Amino acid sequence: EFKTTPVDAAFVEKQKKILSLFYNVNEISYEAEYYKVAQDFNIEASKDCYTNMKAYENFMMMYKVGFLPKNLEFSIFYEKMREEAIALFKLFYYAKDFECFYKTACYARVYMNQGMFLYAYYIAIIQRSDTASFVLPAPYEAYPQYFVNMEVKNKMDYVKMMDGCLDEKICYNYGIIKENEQFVMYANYSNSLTYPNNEDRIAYLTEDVGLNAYYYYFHSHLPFWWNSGKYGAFKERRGEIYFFFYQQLLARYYMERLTNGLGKIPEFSWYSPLRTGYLPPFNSFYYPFAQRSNDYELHTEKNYEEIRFLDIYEKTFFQYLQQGHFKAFDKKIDLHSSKAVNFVGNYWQTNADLFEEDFLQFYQRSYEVNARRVLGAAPKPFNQYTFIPSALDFYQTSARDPAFYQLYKRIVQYIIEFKQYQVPYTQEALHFVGLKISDVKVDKMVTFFDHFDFDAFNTVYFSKEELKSSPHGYKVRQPRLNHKPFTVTIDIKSDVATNAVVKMFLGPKYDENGFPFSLEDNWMNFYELDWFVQKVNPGQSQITRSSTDFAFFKEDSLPMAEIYKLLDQGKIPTDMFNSSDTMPSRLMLPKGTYDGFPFQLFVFVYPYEPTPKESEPFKAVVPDNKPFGYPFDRPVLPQYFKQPNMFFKKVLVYHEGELFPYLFNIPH
Amino acid sequence: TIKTKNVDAVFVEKQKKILSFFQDVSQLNTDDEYYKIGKDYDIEMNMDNYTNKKAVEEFLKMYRTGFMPKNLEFSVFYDKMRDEAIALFHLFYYAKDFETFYKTACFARVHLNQGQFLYAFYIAVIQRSDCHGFVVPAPYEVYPKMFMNMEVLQKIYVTKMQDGLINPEAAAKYGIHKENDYFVYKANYSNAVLYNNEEQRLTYFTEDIGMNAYYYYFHSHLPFWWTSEKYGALKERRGEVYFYFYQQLLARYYFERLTNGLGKIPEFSWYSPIKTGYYPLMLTKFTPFAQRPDYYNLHTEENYERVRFLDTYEKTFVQFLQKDHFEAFGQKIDFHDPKAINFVGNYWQDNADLYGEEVTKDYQRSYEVFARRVLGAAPMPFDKYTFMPSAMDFYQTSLRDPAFYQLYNRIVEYIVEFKQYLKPYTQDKLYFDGVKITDVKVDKLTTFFENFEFDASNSVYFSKEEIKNNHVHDVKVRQPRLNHSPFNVNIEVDSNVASDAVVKIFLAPKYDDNGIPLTLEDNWMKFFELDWFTTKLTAGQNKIIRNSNEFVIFKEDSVPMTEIMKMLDEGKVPFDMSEEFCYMPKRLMLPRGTEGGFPFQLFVFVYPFDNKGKDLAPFESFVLDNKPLGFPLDRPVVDALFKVPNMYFKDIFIYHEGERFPYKFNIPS
Ligand SMILES: *[C@@H]1O[C@H](CO)[C@@H](O[C@@H]2O[C@H](CO)[C@@H](O[C@@H]3O[C@H](CO[C@H]4O[C@H](CO)[C@@H](O)[C@H](O)[C@@H]4O)[C@@H](O)[C@H](O[C@@H]4O[C@H](CO)[C@@H](O)[C@H](O[C@@H]5O[C@H](CO)[C@@H](O)[C@H](O)[C@@H]5O)[C@@H]4O)[C@@H]3O)[C@H](O)[C@H]2NC(C)=O)[C@H](O)[C@H]1NC(C)=O
Ligand SMILES: *[C@@H]1O[C@H](CO)[C@@H](O[C@@H]2O[C@H](CO)[C@@H](O[C@@H]3O[C@H](CO)[C@@H](O)[C@H](O[C@H]4O[C@H](CO)[C@@H](O)[C@H](O)[C@@H]4O[C@@H]4O[C@H](CO)[C@@H](O)[C@H](O)[C@@H]4O)[C@@H]3O)[C@H](O)[C@H]2NC(C)=O)[C@H](O)[C@H]1NC(C)=O
Structure with missing residues (x-):
């Protein structure tokens, strides 16, 4: 269903250690591994767990004073908190190896404000080069209180206080059901x-x-x-x-x-x-x-x-x-x-x-x-x-x-x-001498809503006994935007065999009035859909490219429950590791109309110039010396955009099923 | 396919006479008969030709002081102008018979202001009982300046000055063609050249010449x-008509x-x-219309006095509401009585019937006027005759x-507030004993734009020679207007006992903007009446079929006055111009659809046509019923106490075919 990557055992131990600090973030389990390690971690006597003496001793100055207490809101936008968060990040990031990083996180997971800890910890996992490839749970599982509306949060809290459902039929009528001894709460x-x-x-x-x-x-x-x-x-x-x-x-x-x-x-x-x-x-x-x-x-x-x-x-x-x-x-x-x-x-x-x-x-x-x-x-x-x-x-x-x-x-x-x-691009800078896009065809592009689950267990509180077993099972279910896969078909004639870059953009065709946009006024309203290197043949050839392969979008995150289950197979979800920072696939298309909503697709083909190997911070940074957004990174002289190797297609975006998400959360 | 009707040579003669006044309206053919009559006609000498001694003398006293001069813009919203218009109206209305009326109009055409004349003439023809059955041409044929932007008008002007085209193919690029001996000018709505807020989306509707x-x-x-004294029954119902x-x-x-x-x-x-401005693209031969920028502060120095007036006018009403029962204007009014409407x-x-008088007086300040x-x-106006017009000084431009x-909307809402004092109807009044609607079926509802032409010849000035030879009809404006395909409505009813019944058809939205279904409680005033009729029920099951083009509340397009001359030569007049003058045009019946099909609902009501104790036949051939207008949606409803077996709500979808956008029809290729 979802792209997986085979993964070795040493990896599974570590990923498990990482994921484990994400369970019941709002409480401390006195008998989990992390608590024992924290009790045993003498922060004072471990200068030698860190690359950087200044970072360490900086942390200690602040620590001996005191940090943001537990349970208060953390935000990077206030100075004193940021400076605390950054001191914690530094420690995490200058930890000599993984074990030292693990011990510090345990320590912080126990002794510090949880928002502050989670913030520095996410950031640390992403930046430490020994954690590069490790997966994180989605932020909505880590901070469900920032992603659940109040109504739903109160419903969840009241089922916990009652310790289950009075009777199914009352609760069903409030959008609360049991599946596999787990609670599902429908949310508008x-x-x-x-x-x-x-x-x-x-x-x-x-x-x-x-x-x-x-x-x-x-x-x-x-x-x-x-x-x-x-x-x-x-x-x-x-x-x-x-x-x-x-x-x-x-x-x-x-x-x-x-x-x-x-x-x-x-x-x-x-x-x-x-x-x-x-x-x-x-x-x-x-x-x-x-x-x-x-x-x-x-x-x-x-x-x-x-x-x-x-x-x-x-x-x-x-x-x-x-x-x-x-x-x-x-x-x-x-x-x-x-x-x-x-x-x-x-x-x-x-x-x-x-x-x-x-x-x-x-x-x-x-x-x-x-x-x-x-x-x-x-x-x-x-x-x-x-x-x-x-x-x-x-x-x-x-x-x-x-x-x-x-x-x-x-x-x-x-x-x-x-x-x-900025100087606008000239004819010669945009012309792919010897190559011509002769046609573009697309499959039906169709949007619809369908259900989506995640575990909101992190904002329900649990008893001492329940914590011994790391309890989840409080799921929120939401109608969410989505689209059917489609394919883009590009017809190419060239004189010579060459490596090319192919880029696609989606932009509006008409303004709110119903008038066609000019390139001069619309170049900023195009977003990139895909980028890839193609080997062209001489003569007439054909490129097909599925939406599921678009460079700039990802599959849905899996819940930790699924992550551990996959881990038990030595499997890991590619998209959660290779590109978390990329927009979700289901939102690639704006909601259509039953009618078919008019938009336009820009396909651009230009030569591939061999640019060596890096390891940058986003998947938007593509192996190319070109500006990001190129050739729509600056003002446009529209007379230069009729290059043989460019092509604008009218596409229509449809919608299927119910037009309104609430129609999916109605009881009977 | 124009609904016709046959006529005698006496009619044709009178009708040709009436129509003559609408030709070349801003000029005089000193050769035409209307001139000879008009020039010499002595009013004092003809006092015995009028039903009303003092209306003649009041007029002649007014006329000696002097009337609004020629060429200046007339509007009825200004004191001195109104009073001259009324003074002239009376003269027209009290003419003994047609001969007198006709000679009187000839005089008025030659000597009075043309907008003043036309305004009074038009009303006179609708009002004179001996003119019932006569035809007047479309207001857009009479005042074409009012129904078109500066752009078209200037093209028209340019063509007349050059006396044709210097370059056929350059003209084509400007939407100017010669067909026959006519000049056709294509015309866009104002949004094709001006998009200053979102309201510009609707200019095919608000600029529609029909609307x-x-x-x-x-x-x-x-x-x-x-007063409405001349319409008998309608007098105790005038307020209800106004609301409705x-x-x-x-x-x-x-919609x-x-x-x-x-x-x-x-x-x-x-x-x-106020947020949304208006930037009129219309020209007065003397001036430009006034503009209201966006965010226009209503309360600036020049308005301090007018706004104190509007505010008290409103507050006095809020006080009537709070009081429930009170004596105002020499009448005890009770708010629980539905007749208080x-x-x-x-x-x-602020109409004459509010005071129980024939004609309103200057000191009876109107809220709408202000x-x-x-x-x-x-x-502020320069003097009594000189003002800076806005769209709202004229009935032709207000929309x-x-x-x-x-x-x-403001005024209607205040009326809705009073409506809250009316008891909602019970089961009992709405329930048709033994009658039930089992199904309603509708043909596809589709909208589309198609071209429409009209004679714009009155906007243009002709030479002495052209006026003689009568080549004075040569300018047509071509403009896309909304329209819709004919559609049927099948009503299937069960009734055990045969009897006469009224069938009523209403159109309404299905969702607000959030896409939540319309409850009746809130949304009863957003229902639009499509049709009124009666049938005979029989025991068993019946099928009632009704075409959209049999709908009583709508009419066909007027025909150009040129074609009325063709027809009068055969002894015919188009039916819908004669007795269906003032209904909405059929083409505008439905809102413009979407290509996926926009959700509406259709409401169908069937109730007994008992007798006809009291029925409207005076102004409108409308409520042949003892029933309030918009019955049963004339007052607040209770969803629960409302629905009965003889009502049917059906979900309906409004489509659109061809170009979505009018301007697409005016592209030259
Ligand atoms: C109702 O409202 C009132 C007023 O808003 C509120 O009172 C406040 O309560 C809080 C705690 O709940 C008080 O804060 C505590 O105060 C003591 C003493 O404060 C004074 O002494 C300090 C040093 O002597 C001085 O620096 C201060 O400026 C102050 O003058 C503190 O000792 C408390 O403990 C700290 O809390 C932090 C933990 O979150 C840590 O930073 C800190 O270090 C840690 O401590 C342990 C020892 O326990 C140490 O071994 C570790 O190294 C560890 O890092 C320490 O624990 C705390 O700050 C606050 O002062 C009260 N306000 C006022 C005006 O008096 C009530 O609580 C509210 N009631 C209700 C029911 O809501
Ligand atoms: C109602 O409203 C709509 C929308 O506003 C109006 O629709 C617009 O109509 C325009 C024509 O008036 C149209 O512009 C043309 O577009 C076509 C297609 O690209 C061009 O071929 C035309 O260009 C010619 O005229 C230009 C200047 O007038 C010249 O610069 C240009 O050279 C060209 O001439 C031709 O090209 C050759 C040059 O090599 C020349 O040798 C040859 O002899 C030719 O003469 C126009 O630009 C708009 O595009 C159109 N807008 C939209 C959105 O569709 C409509 O006109 C309005 N209608 C009325 C009745 O008022």
Whole structure:
């Protein structure tokens, strides 16, 4: 069913050790392995478990003081917590070998705030080169409270308090059933009480567990606060990735907007009311998540300083552009080079690369952090360890808030204003001399919703006795967007046998009006679907390529239950190991219409130039010296896009079955 | 295929005379008979030719002070202009007989303002009992300036100045063709050139020449400023008609919103800015129409006085609501009485019947008049005769403005509030003893666009020679309009006892924007009436078939006045122009479908046609029933106490064929 990889026994021991810190994250089991190891791990007397004496002794300074206590909300966006998280990450990452890393994690798993631990631990598994290939459970299994709406969470809690079902038939009518002595709780996406506006049409994409997790993975693969020295040659292209990642996401999101009749992502002002509100159905130990009403005035007393910070952060960018020959933080940088694109993305992110340092420093203030605090609408932190959460406080929940897409669309618009200074590609740079795409055909592209399970066991609490047996079996089931596999068929005539790159993009055909888009106005609204190297023959030849093979999408994560079962076969899911940071397959297509929703497919073929071997942080970084998003990485002169080796096809996206997800969660 | 009807040479003569006034409307053929009559006609001398001594003298006192001059724009929303229009109306209406009427109009055509004349003439013909049965051409043929953008108009103007085309093939590129001795101009809706908000999705509806012409007919059949005493039975029902007309219009419009993915009509405040602007592309020979930018602050200095008026007008009503029972306007009104709907509607239209008078007076300030002015965004009028027009100074253009629908949504909603005082019908009143609907079946419902032409000749000025030789009809405008295929409705009913029955057909949405099914409790006012009729039931099972083109509430397109001349030569007139003047055009019956098929519901009601104790035959051949208009959806419903064996809700889907977008019809290749 799913791609597997054979895996050896030494691997199985280690993967098991890793996965085991993810069970009942909210409680300590006094008789699990990890607790004994933690009791036995003398942090004081193990300087020699670490590569780096400075990292170690830094941790100890903080530790002898004290860290964020257990059970409070952790967010990387508050300074003191970040600095604690980073100290923990350093320890994890400079652990001499796996056993030392294991012991430290056990230690932290017992003695530290669980959000803080989980955050550094994910990040550590991904970055340590001895853990590179190891698999993680999906964030929704690790943090189910950020992915379950309140309604469902309370239903789960009440079945635990009752220790099961009064009678099946009552519970069935509340969407609660038993399968194989496991509880299944049916969950709707939220109604207009949480999206009090049109943005509620889109709840099935914005609340999707895959899409939210996607963003979390993205953050974990290269956190803003860390340099990218780990990845060598890639360092010089970090800011490029930032733009590309957000341009792609907004392209995807606009496409969902279009199929639900919704139009452009709205623009705002720090000095004006923001139109579209959001009321999160989440809560922390102390606080329900902050709500932002409709027409929320951004410019109130408590935001005045933050807004002045944000306002000048943007205008500083404008001043660079006005000046052409800019220069922040050491060098003079020219706008027509690419040292430039690097700078641009880093600038908007305030990442560690901007300042050319290893880790972000306590006093270095982020644009994104301050925007997130203003848009999140929360009252100010009570003390440094206690803030009032909003959706924008976490990567697991950010994509739920319409303001998220508005903030990032603004940043993307600014970056695009810079792209006006880049030289557009000429005819000769885009022409594949001697080669011509003569036709493109596609299978029916069809979307539908179907059910989806995950274990939400991590936010139910369990007794001392039950913990001895690491208990799960509280499953949430959700209708989720999906599509049928299709094939793309490309017809090629060339003069000569050569290696080629084939790329595919999906973009809109018509605006909200019903007018055709021009390339000049639409290049930013295409997202990449696939990338691959093909060996062409001389003459007439034919390339077929299934959607299940598209380079940039993954299969669904498996639950840990399945992971252990596969592990017992020496098997592992390829997609969870080789590409967690990639968008889920089921969301590759925006919801269609029974009708057939008009979009367009761009197939581009250009020569393969042999670029040697790396090991970069995302699967978006493909073995090619070309810009990411190439040839749609910058403004376009439309007269150059009628190259024989390019082809635009109208495709229609259909939908099958029920149009509305709630029709799948109705009892009788 | 035009529903015809036969006529005698006396009719044709009168009819040709009536029609003569609509030719070359902005000019005088000093050769035509209408001129000779008009020039010399002495009104004082003819006082004995009028039913009303003082209406003649009132007129002649007005006429000696002077009337609105030629060429300036007329609108009935301004005091002095209205009063002259009414003064002239009376003169027309009290003419002894046709001869007198005709000579009077000749005078008015030669000497009075043309929009003033036409406005009064039009109404006179609908109102004079000796003119019932006569035909008037389409308002778009009469005021083509009002039914088309600047772009077409300028092309038309350019062609007349050059006296033809310098380059046939360059003209073709501009949507300008010569067919026969006609110039045909293709025309787009305004969204093909302007997309300033989402409301531009709906310009094939709001700019539809049929829909706009419809509203002008409605106004002309019963002006707010005139009593309805002449319509007998309708007098105690005037308010209900007013509500019903807007309620219907707004349900229809809302449907166009849903299929274009736009949801509820937005609410506004007199104290806040309003979101959606309007940017008229229409030209006045003297001026440009006023623009309302987006986020127009209604409450600026120039409106402080008008808004204090609108607010009290509204609040007085909120006070009536709170009071339940009260004496207003010299009448004790009770809100639990359903008949109070008469007063309610009258109050919002500030019509003459509110005061129980023949004609409204200047000091009876109208709410609608002042809402239209406020929302129109015009600067203050220069003087009594000189204003900056907006879409909302004219019945012909009002539907073009999104703010129009918001205004009347506002008023309708306040009326809905009063409706909450009415007891919902019980089982007992709705239940047809021994009758049951077992099935309803519908033919595919499909929409599509097809081209439509009209004579735009009145927008153009002809030379003395052309006026003589009567080559004055040569300009046609071609524009895609919405339409639909004919479809049948099969009703299968069981009844044990034979008897007469009324069959009613209603159309409604099926889901809100969240895609939750419409409950009746909330959504009874979003039902649009398609058809009213009677049949004979027999014991056993019957099949009732009804075609969409037998639907009583809709009419066929008017024919151009040129074709009416052709027909009058055979002794014929098109039926739907004569007694079905003021119904909505059939082509606009259904909202534009989607290609996958948009979900609606069809509601079918069957109830006994007992006798006809009281039936409407005065203004409208409409409610031949003792039943409220929109019966049984004229008041709030209870889902549970509502459904009975003789009602059927059927799920229906509205398709669309061919091009989705009008502009696709105007591409040259
Ligand atoms: C109702 O509301 C009130 C007020 O909000 C709230 O009171 C607060 O309770 C918390 C704890 O629940 C209090 O915090 C504790 O305070 C003591 C002493 O605090 C003072 O002394 C410190 C040093 O002497 C000084 O530095 C402080 O600034 C302060 O003046 C602390 O000792 C407590 O323990 C720490 O807690 C952390 C664990 O989460 C650790 O960082 C820390 O280190 C650890 O400790 C062990 C020894 O136990 C050591 O061996 C390890 O090395 C380990 O790292 C230590 O355990 C704790 O901070 C807070 O002060 C109260 N507020 C006020 C204003 O008095 C009530 O609790 C609320 N009640 C309810 C029912 O909700
Ligand atoms: C209603 O609204 C719709 C939508 O707005 C209008 O539809 C538009 O109609 C346009 C024509 O008026 C059409 O533009 C043409 O597109 C075709 C197809 O690509 C081109 O062939 C045309 O280009 C010719 O004219 C240009 C300038 O006018 C020249 O620059 C160009 O050279 C070309 O001329 C020809 O090409 C040769 C050059 O090598 C030349 O030698 C030869 O002799 C030719 O003359 C136009 O660009 C729009 O594309 C179309 N819009 C859409 C979205 O479809 C419609 O016109 C409006 N209708 C009315 C009645 O107002």
